Short mmCIF file of C-alpha atoms in Angstrom, two decimals:
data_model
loop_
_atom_site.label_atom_id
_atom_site.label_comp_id
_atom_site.label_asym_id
_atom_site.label_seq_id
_atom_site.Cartn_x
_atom_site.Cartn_y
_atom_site.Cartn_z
CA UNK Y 1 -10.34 -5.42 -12.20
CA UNK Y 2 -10.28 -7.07 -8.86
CA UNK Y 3 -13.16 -6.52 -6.67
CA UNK Y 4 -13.88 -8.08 -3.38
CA UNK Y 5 -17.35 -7.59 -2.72
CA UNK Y 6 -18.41 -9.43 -5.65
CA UNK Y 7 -17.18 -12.78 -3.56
CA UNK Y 8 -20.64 -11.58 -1.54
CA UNK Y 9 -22.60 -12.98 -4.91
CA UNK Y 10 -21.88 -16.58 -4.27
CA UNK B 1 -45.25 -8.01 3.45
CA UNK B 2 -45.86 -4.34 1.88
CA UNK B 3 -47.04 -3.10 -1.49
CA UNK B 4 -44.65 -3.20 -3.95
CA UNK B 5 -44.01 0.23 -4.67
CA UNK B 6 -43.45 1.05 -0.75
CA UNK B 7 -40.56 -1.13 -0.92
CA UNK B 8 -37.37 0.38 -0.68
CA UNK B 9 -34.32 -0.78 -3.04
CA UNK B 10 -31.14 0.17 -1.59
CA UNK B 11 -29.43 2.98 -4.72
CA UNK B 12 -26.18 3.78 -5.56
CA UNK B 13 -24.04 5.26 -3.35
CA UNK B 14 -23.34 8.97 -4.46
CA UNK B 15 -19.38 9.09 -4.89
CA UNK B 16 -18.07 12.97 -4.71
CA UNK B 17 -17.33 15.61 -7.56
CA UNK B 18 -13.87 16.96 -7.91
CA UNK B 19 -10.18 16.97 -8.71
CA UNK B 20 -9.37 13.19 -9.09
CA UNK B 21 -8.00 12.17 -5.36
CA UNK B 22 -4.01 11.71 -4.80
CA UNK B 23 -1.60 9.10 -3.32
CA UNK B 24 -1.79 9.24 0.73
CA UNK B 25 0.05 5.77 1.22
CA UNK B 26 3.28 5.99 3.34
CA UNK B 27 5.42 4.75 0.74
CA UNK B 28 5.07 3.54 -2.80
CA UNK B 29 3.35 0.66 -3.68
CA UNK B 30 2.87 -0.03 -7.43
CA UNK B 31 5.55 2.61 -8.35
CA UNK B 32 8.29 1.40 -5.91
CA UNK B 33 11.59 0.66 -7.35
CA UNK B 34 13.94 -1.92 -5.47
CA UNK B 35 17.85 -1.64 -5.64
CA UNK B 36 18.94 -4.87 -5.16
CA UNK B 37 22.32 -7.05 -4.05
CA UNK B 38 22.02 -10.91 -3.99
CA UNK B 39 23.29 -11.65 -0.22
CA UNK B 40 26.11 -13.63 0.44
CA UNK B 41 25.89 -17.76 0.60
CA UNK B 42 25.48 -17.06 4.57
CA UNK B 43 22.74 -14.45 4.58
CA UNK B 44 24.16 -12.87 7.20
CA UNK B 45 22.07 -9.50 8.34
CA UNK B 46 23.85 -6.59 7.12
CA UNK B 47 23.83 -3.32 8.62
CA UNK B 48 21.45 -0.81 7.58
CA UNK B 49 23.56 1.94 6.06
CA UNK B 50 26.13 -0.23 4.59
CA UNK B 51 23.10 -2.58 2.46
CA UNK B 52 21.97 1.15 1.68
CA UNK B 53 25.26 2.25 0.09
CA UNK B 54 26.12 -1.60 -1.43
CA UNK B 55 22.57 -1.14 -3.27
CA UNK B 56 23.05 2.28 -4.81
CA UNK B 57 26.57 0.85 -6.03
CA UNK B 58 24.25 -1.80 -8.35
CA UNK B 59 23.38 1.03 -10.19
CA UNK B 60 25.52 2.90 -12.90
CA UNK B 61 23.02 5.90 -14.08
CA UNK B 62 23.42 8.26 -11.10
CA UNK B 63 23.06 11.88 -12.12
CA UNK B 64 23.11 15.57 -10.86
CA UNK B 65 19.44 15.80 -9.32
CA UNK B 66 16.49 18.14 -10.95
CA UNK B 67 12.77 18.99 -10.29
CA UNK B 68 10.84 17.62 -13.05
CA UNK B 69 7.11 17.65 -10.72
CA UNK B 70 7.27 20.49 -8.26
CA UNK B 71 5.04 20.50 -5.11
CA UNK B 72 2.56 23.15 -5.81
CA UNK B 73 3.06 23.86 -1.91
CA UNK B 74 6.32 23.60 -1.01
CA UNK B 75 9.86 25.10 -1.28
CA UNK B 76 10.94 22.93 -4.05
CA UNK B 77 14.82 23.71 -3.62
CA UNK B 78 14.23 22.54 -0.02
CA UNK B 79 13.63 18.78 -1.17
CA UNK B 80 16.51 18.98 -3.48
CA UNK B 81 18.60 20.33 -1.62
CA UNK B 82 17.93 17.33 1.30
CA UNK B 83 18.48 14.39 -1.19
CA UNK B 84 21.70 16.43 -1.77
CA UNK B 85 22.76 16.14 1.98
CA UNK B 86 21.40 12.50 2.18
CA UNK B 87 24.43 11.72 -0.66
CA UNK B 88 26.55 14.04 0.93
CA UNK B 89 26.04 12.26 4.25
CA UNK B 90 26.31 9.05 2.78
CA UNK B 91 29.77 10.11 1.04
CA UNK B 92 30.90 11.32 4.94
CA UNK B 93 30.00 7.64 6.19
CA UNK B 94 32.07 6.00 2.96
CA UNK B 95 34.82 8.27 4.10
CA UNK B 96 34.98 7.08 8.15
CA UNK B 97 37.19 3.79 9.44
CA UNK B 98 33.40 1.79 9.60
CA UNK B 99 30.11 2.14 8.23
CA UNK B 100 27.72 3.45 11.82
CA UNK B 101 24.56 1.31 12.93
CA UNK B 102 22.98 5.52 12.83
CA UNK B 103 23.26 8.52 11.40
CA UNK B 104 22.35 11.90 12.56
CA UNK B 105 21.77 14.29 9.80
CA UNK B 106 23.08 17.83 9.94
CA UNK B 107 19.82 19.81 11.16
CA UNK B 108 20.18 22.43 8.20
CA UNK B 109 17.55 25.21 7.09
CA UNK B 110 16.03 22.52 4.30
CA UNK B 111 15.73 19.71 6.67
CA UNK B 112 14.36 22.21 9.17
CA UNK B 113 11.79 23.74 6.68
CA UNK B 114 10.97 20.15 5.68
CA UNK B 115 10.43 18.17 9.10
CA UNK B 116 8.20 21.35 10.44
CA UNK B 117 11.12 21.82 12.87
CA UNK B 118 -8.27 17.84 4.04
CA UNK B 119 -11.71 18.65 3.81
CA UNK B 120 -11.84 19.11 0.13
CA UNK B 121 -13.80 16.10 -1.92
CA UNK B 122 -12.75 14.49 -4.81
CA UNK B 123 -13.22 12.62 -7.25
CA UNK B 124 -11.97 8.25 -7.69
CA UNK B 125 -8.96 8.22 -10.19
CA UNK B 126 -8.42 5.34 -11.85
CA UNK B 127 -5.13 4.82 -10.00
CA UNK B 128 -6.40 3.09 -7.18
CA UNK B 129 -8.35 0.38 -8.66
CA UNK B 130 -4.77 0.24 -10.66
CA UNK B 131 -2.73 -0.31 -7.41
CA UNK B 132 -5.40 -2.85 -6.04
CA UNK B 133 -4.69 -5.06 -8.88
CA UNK B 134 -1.09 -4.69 -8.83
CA UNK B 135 -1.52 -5.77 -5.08
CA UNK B 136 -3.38 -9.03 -6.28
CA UNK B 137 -0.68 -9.98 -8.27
CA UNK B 138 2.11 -12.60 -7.96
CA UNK B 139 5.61 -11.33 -7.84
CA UNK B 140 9.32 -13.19 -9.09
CA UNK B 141 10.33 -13.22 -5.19
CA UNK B 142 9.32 -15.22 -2.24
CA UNK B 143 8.43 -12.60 1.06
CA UNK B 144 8.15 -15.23 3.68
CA UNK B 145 8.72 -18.37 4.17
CA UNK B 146 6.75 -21.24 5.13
CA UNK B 147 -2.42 -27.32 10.31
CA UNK B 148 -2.32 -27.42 6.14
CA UNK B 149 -1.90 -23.60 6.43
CA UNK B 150 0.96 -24.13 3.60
CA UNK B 151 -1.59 -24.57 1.06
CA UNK B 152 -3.08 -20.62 1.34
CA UNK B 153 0.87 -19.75 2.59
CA UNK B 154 2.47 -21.24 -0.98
CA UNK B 155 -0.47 -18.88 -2.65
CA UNK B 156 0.53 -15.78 -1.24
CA UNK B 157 4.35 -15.92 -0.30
CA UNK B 158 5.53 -14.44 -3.73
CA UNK B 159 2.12 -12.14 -3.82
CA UNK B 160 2.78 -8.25 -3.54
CA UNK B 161 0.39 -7.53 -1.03
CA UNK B 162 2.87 -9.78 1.19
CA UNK B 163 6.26 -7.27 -0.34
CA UNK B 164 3.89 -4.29 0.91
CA UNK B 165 3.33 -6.01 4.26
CA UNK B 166 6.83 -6.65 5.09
CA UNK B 167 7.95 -3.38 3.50
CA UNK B 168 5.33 -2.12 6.43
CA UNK B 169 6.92 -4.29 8.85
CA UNK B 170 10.98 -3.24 8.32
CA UNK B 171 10.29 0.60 7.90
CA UNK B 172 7.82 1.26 11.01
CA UNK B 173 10.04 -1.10 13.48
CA UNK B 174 13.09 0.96 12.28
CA UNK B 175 11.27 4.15 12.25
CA UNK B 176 9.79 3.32 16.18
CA UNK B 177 13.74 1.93 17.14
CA UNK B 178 14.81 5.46 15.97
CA UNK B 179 11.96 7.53 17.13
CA UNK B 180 12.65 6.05 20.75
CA UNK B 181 16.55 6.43 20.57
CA UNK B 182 17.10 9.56 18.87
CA UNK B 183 14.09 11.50 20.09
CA UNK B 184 15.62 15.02 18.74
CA UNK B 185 17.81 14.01 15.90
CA UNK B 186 17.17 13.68 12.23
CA UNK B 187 17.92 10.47 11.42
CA UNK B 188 18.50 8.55 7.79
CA UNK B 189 16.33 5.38 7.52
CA UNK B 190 17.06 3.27 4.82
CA UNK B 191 14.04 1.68 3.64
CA UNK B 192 14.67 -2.08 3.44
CA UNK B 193 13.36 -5.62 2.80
CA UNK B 194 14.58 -9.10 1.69
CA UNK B 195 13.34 -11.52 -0.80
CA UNK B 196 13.86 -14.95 -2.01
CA UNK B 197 14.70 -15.24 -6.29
CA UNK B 198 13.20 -18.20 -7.98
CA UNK B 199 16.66 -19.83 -8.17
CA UNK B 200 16.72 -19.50 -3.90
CA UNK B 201 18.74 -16.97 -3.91
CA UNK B 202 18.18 -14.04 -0.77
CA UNK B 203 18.49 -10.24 -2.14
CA UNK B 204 18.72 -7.12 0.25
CA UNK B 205 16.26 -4.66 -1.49
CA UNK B 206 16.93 -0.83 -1.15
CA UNK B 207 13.61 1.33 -1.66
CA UNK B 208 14.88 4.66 -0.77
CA UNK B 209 15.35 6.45 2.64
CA UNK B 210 12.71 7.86 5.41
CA UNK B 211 14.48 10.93 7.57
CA UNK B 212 12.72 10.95 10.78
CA UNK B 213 11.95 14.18 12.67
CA UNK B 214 12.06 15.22 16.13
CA UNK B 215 9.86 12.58 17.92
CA UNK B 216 8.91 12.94 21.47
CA UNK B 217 6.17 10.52 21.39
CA UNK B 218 4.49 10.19 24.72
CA UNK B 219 1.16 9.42 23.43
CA UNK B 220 0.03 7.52 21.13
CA UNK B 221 -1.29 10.07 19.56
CA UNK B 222 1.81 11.92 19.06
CA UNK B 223 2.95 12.58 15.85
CA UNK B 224 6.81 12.44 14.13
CA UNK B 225 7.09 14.09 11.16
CA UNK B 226 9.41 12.44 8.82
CA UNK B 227 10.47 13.17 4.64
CA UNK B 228 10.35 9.98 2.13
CA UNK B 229 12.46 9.82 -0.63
CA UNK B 230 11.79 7.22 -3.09
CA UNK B 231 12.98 5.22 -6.13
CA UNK B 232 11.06 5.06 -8.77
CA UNK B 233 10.66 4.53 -12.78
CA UNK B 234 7.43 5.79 -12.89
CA UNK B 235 7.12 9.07 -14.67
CA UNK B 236 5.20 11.90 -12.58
CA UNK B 237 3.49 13.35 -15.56
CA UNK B 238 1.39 9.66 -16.84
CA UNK B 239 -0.69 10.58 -13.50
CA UNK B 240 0.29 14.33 -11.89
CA UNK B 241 -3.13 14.24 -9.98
CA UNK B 242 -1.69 10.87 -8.41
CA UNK B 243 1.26 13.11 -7.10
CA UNK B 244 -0.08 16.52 -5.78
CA UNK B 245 1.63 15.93 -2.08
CA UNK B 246 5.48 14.94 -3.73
CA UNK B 247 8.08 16.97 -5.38
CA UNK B 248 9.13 14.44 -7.60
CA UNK B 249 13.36 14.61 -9.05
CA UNK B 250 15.12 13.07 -12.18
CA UNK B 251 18.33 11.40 -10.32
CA UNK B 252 19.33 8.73 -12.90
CA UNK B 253 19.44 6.63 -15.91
CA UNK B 254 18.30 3.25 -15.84
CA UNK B 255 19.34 0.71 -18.43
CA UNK B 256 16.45 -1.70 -19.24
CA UNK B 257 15.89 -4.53 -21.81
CA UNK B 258 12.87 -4.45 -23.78
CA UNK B 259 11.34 -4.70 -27.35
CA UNK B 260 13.16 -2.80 -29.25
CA UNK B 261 15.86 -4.16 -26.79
CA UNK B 262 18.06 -1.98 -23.90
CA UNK B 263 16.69 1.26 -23.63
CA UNK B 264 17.39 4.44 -21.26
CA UNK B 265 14.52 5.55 -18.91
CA UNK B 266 14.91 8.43 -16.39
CA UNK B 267 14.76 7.04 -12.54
CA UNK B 268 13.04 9.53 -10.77
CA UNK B 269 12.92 9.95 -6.98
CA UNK B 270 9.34 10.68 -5.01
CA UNK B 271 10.25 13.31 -2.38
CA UNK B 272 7.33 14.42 0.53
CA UNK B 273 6.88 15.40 3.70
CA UNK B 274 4.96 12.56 5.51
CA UNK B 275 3.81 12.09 9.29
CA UNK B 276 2.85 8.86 11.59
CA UNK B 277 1.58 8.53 15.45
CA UNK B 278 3.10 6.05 17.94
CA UNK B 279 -0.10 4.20 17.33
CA UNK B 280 0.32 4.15 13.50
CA UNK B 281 3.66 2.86 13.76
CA UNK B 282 2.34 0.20 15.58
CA UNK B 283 -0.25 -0.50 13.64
CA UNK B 284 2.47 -0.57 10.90
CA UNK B 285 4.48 -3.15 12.69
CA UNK B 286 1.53 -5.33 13.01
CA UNK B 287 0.96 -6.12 9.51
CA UNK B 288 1.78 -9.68 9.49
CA UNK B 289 -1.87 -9.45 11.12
CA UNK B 290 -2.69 -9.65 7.16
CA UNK B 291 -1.60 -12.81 6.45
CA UNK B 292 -3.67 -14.26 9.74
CA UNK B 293 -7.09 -11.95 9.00
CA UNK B 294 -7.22 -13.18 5.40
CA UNK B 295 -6.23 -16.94 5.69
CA UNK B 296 -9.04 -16.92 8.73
CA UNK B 297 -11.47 -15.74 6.17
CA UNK B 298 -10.20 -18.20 3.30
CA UNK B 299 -11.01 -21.06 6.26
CA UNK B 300 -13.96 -19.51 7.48
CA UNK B 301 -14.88 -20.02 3.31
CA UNK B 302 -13.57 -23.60 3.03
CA UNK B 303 -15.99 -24.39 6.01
CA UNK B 304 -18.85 -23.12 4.07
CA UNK B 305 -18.34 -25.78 1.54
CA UNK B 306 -17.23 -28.55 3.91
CA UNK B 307 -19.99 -28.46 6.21
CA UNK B 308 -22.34 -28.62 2.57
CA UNK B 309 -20.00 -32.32 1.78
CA UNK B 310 -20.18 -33.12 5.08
CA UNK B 311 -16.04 -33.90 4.37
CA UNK B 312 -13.02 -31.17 4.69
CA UNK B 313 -12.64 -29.62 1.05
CA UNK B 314 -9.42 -27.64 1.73
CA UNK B 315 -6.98 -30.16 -0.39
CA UNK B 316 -9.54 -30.38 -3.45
CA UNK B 317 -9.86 -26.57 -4.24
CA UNK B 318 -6.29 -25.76 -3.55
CA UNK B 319 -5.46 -28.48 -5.60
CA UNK B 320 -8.15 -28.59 -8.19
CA UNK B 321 -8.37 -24.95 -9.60
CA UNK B 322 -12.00 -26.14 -11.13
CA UNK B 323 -13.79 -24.68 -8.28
CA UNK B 324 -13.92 -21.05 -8.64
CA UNK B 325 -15.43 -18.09 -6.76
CA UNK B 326 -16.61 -14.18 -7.93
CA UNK B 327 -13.42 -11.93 -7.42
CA UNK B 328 -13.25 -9.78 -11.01
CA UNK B 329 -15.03 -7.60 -13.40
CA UNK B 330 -15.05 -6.05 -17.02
CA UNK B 331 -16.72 -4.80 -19.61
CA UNK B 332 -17.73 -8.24 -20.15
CA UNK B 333 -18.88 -9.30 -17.04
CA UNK B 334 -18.17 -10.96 -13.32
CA UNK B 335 -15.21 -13.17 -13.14
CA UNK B 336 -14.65 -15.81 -11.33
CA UNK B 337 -11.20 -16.98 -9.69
CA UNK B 338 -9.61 -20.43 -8.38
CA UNK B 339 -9.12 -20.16 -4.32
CA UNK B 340 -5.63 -18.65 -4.90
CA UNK B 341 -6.58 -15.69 -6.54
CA UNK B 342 -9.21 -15.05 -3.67
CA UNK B 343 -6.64 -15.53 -0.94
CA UNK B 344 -4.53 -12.70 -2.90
CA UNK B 345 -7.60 -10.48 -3.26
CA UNK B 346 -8.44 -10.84 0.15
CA UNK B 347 -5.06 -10.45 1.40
CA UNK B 348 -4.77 -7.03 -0.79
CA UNK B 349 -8.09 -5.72 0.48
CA UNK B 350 -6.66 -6.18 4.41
CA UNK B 351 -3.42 -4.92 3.62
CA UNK B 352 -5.08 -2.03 1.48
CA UNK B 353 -7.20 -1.54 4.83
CA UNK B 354 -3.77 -1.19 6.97
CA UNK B 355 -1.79 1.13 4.19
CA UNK B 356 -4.96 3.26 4.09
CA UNK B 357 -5.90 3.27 7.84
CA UNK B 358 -8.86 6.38 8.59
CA UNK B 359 -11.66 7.12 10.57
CA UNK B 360 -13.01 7.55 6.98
CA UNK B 361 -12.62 3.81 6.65
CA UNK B 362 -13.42 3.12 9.89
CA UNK B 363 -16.95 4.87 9.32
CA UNK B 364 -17.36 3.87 6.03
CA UNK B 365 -16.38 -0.42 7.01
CA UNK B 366 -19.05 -0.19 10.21
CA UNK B 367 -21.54 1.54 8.39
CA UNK B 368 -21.21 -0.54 4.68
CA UNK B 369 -21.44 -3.72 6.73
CA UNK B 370 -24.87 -3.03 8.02
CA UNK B 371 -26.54 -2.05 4.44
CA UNK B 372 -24.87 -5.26 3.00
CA UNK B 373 -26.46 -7.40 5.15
CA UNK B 374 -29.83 -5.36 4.08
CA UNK B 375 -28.74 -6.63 0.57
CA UNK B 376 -27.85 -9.63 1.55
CA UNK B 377 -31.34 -10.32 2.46
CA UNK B 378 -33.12 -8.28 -0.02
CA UNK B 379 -31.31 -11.35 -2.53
CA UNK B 380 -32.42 -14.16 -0.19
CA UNK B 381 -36.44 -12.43 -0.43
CA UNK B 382 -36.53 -11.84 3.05
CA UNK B 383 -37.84 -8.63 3.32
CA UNK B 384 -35.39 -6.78 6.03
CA UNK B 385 -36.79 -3.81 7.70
CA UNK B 386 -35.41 -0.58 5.58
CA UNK B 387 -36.47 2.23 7.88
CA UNK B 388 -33.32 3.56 8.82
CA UNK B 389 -31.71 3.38 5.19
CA UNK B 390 -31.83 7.33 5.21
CA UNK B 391 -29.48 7.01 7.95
CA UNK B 392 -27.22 4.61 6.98
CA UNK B 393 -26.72 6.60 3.21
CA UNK B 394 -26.31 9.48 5.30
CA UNK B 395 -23.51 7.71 7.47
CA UNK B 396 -21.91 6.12 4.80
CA UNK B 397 -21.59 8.71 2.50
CA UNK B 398 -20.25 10.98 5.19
CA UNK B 399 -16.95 9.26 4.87
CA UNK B 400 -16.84 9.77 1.12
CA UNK B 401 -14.86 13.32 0.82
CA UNK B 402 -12.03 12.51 -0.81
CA UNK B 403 -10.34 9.04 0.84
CA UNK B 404 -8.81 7.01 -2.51
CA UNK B 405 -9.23 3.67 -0.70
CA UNK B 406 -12.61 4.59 0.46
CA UNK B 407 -13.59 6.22 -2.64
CA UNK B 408 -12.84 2.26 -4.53
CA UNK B 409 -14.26 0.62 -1.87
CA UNK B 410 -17.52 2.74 -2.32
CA UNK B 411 -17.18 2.29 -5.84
CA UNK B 412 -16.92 -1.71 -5.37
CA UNK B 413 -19.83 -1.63 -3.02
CA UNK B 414 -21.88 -0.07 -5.93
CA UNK B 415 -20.47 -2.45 -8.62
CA UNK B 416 -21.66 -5.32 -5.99
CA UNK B 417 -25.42 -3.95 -6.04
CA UNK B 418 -25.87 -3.41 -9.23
CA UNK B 419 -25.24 -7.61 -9.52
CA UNK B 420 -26.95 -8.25 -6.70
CA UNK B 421 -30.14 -6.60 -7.42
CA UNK B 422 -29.91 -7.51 -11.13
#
């Protein structure tokens, strides 16, 4: 599942 | 610094009981269904009606329409009775010298019922996460054609978010071109777009057909009311929550090639009533915006890492897939994705953010923002001041009634924390 806000963990 | 146990870690946000939510979008996304000629050598535009009527010719299952998912609210026989007329005003156009640029439908007691001439929560189906991934996803067919901008253009020119975008584009210019012509008539839209095949070939796709309603729109404000009718293989009872606004009709039988090899499946059409503003419209028109919001945030990235080297990374992670970035979940775990995969995923989110346009969003984007950066330095140690965090929840979760995009989005913003404040 695509999720976005995870790009905010890098 | 504070005590410990004074601290405040920011919770889950509280996501509403109810029935699951339902589809809001102006048109299909995931469940569209494209009727399709391969253009000419020349590629010469087409008129309207006539690419309507050479695309329902491609197909050889057409059959005497029936309700198979009524609208709880509506006068079912009304919507079957208008994709009646729309073939029976499509067989008057066959039947004159030339094919018109418009047509006026007969304003008849269905059309009349239908054209008009939610504070309820609920609950996150699974649907929309479903469609968001869908949206991520590359297609067969090229949607636009091609400063190494090409790089981040090649990655999302054959992506669905871009069909959805210029889908967007065709049916809310046509829709505003008829709305200012034919402020008083009902007039047949067909829905349109054009592709590119691997083999370079253009196609003419047909969708379906909008009928617009009387539309006086001074303001921008101002509302037309309009019916959608829809093509579709999807079947209405895998997801009937999904459909609670459509009466949905079996119209046809569609040939397609599979394990067990060709197979019959029922086409269905997706019938509602539907409205837009002047300003929606425009909005609508303005997709391409998409493309430009998503790419700046894909640069805005590639700076990140640049100004770390000290040397412009663009051609090394567009070229070498090795460097990867958090875009995914699963059971499993967070996954992480090659730059192409996050210029899809961030395309989808701003096109998802244009399909599903609220105040709801609206409140919910301003208002999310400001507790992520609270994360965001509750990660980094930093100790943010947390003394409006009662009003921020309260904000934020205002705007979680029953929105499908903003119930994911909520739902996102909780997988996010749980991650973050591992």
């Amino acid at each position: 599942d695509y999720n976005p806000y995870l790009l905010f963990l890098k | 610094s504070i005590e410990p146990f004074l601290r405040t870690t920011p919770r889950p946000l509280r996501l509403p009981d109810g029935p699951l939510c339902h589809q809001r979008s102006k048109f299909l996304l995931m469940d569209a269904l494209k009727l399709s000629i391969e253009d000419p050598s020349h590629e010469g535009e087409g008129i309207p009606l006539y690419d309507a009527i050479k695309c329902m010719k491609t197909f050889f299952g057409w059959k005497e329409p029936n309700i198979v998912k009524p609208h709880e609210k509506g006068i079912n026989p009304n919507y079957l009775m208008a994709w009646k007329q729309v073939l029976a005003e499509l067989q008057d156009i066959e039947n004159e010298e030339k094919i018109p640029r418009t047509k006026n439908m007969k304003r008849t007691s269905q059309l009349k019922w239908a054209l008009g001439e939610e504070p309820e929560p609920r609950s996150l189906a699974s649907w929309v996460q479903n469609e968001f991934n869908k949206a991520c996803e590359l297609t067969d067919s090229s949607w636009i054609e091609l400063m190494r901008r090409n790089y981040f253009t090649a990655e999302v020119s054959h992506c669905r978010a871009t069909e959805y975008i210029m889908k967007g584009v065709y049916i809310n210019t046509a829709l505003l071109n008829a709305s200012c012509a034919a402020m008083d008539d009902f007039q047949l839209i067909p829905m349109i777009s054009k592709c590119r095949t691997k083999e370079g070939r253009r196609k003419t796709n047909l969708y379906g057909f909008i009928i617009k309603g009387r539309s006086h729109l001074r303001n921008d404000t101002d509302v037309v009311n309009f019916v959608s009718m829809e093509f579709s293989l999807t079947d209405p009872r895998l997801e009937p929550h999904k459909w609670e606004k459509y009466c949905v009709l079996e119209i046809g039988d569609m040939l397609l090639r599979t394990a067990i090899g060709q197979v019959s499946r029922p086409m269905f059409l997706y019938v509602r009533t539907n409205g837009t503003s002047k300003i929606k419209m425009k909005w609508g028109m303005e997709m391409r915006r998409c493309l430009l919001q998503s790419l700046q945030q894909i640069e805005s990235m590639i700076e990140a890492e640049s100004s770390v080297k000290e040397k412009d990374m663009t051609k090394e992670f567009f070229e070498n897939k090795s460097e990867t970035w958090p875009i995914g979940e699963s059971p499993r775990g967070v996954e992480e994705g090659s730059i192409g995969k996050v210029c899809r995923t961030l395309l989808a989110k701003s096109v998802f953010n244009s399909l599903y346009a609220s105040p709801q969003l609206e409140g919910f984007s301003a208002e999310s923002r400001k507790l992520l950066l609270i994360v965001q330095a509750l990660r980094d140690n930093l100790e943010p001041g947390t003394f409006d965090l009662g009003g921020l929840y309260e904000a934020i979760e205002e705007c979680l009634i029953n929105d499908p995009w903003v119930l994911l989005n909520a739902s996102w913003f909780n997988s996010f924390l749980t991650h973050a404040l591992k």
